[PDB]
Symmetry: C3
């Protein structure tokens, strides 16, 4: 009832560029009016598996993973996360109690040039369990115009990494629940 | 019963320098012995609404918001937060269960004004949803000698911001509850 | 029943180098599938009580505190934390519900000493309630080969501190519970 998560299954479950290029671990625990969230990310194959900006001049320093939800709090197929890996810890009918509160985190109006900053959380996370491999995780609620609710995970970094795996440490955050 | 918060009402509710110059969003959720806290801050008018240190030589790079509580956990009149915006999520009589634990976070003795470091939490938060607009939030418990309990929110920054709104990202923390 | 903690007893309770050289405050609160954790550390005597790299050339800039648990989630005598200071908030028989999940945070296999990055959390904490005294706390789960479960707290810093007490600010994190 009270936890929505990616399983701990070792199978890849997420698309950054290509199907199953990544494994997202996301745990959402309902503590009444707040969701306690825990996240980590491993890239298992493709261009972000091993970062080397000395040898690959064309490699970006960002990617984004989106969880898109309908008006019943059901994960949409268009999400980067595979629906087959998303369920209660013990497919579901209602998870509006896990959704980011729309009054707290309003969607952008047609006339609105961006979201309120309160819709965003920043975290400093690290690759390969080392403090000198920083990555910025930018978590934004309800940014995706075509979904009832959304959680957007933007990863970005500045370092010219040389043969560093995108294998992230864990980060905790919370957000205000819709109900 | 289990969440004490500022409403999500769009109305300003907080005084930095002037009445209703700011809108504090603070959610305290009781998970037994710990309070799970979520905070953001928007300045709606006055000298901190738009930061420009190129054009305003006299502008500080800090301000402080205090929540002062009596022995029943009731918000006191001299608090920066307006009492009309502070209530259980669904005029309260007792909120000692939400107060920062006095054994964990002792008040300063007459022979020292200087608290144990455990009474303080630091967070790195950001303005206008950009990682290159850092602000330090310093949360201190029970620093106010003249109140039974207190939560002090000190905001400070170093950057000579040029036309940046004080519109903060969200931050989560926790603290040990009095009961 | 839902909180496992170091008491708030003012007595030292922890060994960095020598018995009772430190006082760890650690609070683990069970919110179903996640443990909400709160930590601070005061060094009360010995070489880390007052850091001065100007006057002591031989002083390290790191130390580690380990909590080692048996298959019933009972703190082992080999831990840096003294067992006499570790109990439920209101000697215990079973605390597996507080243990770091072995599927989430696997122990290193004979064929690899190297943990998944998701076993680690980094935090930036501070000494003496000042933002310009940074310390890195590195929390790692299930790293200790000789125990069923473990929480390892590695503290490190870079600054040539001059007469700064190791009196840390508080930090919140969470982790996935074994059951």
């Amino acid at each position: 009832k009270l936890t929505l998560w990616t399983t701990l299954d070792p199978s890849p479950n997420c698309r950054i560029d290509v199907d199953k290029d990544s494994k997202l671990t996301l745990v959402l625990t309902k503590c009444g009016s707040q969701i306690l969230a825990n996240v980590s990310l491993l890239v298992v194959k493709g261009r972000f598996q091993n970062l080397n900006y000395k040898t690959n001049p064309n490699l970006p320093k960002t990617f984004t993973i989106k969880l898109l939800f309908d008006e019943n709090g059901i994960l949409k197929d268009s999400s980067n996360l595979d629906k087959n890996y998303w369920n209660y810890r013990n497919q579901y009918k209602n998870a509006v109690g896990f959704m980011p509160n729309l009054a707290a985190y309003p969607k952008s109006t047609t006339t609105q040039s961006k979201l309120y900053a309160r819709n965003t959380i920043f975290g400093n996370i690290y690759l390969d369990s080392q403090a000198y491999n920083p990555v910025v995780i930018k978590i934004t609620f309800n940014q995706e115009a075509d979904s009832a609710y959304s959680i957007t995970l933007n990863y970005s970094w500045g370092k010219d990494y040389e043969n560093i795996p995108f294998d992230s440490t864990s980060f905790t955050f919370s957000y205000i629940a819709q109900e």
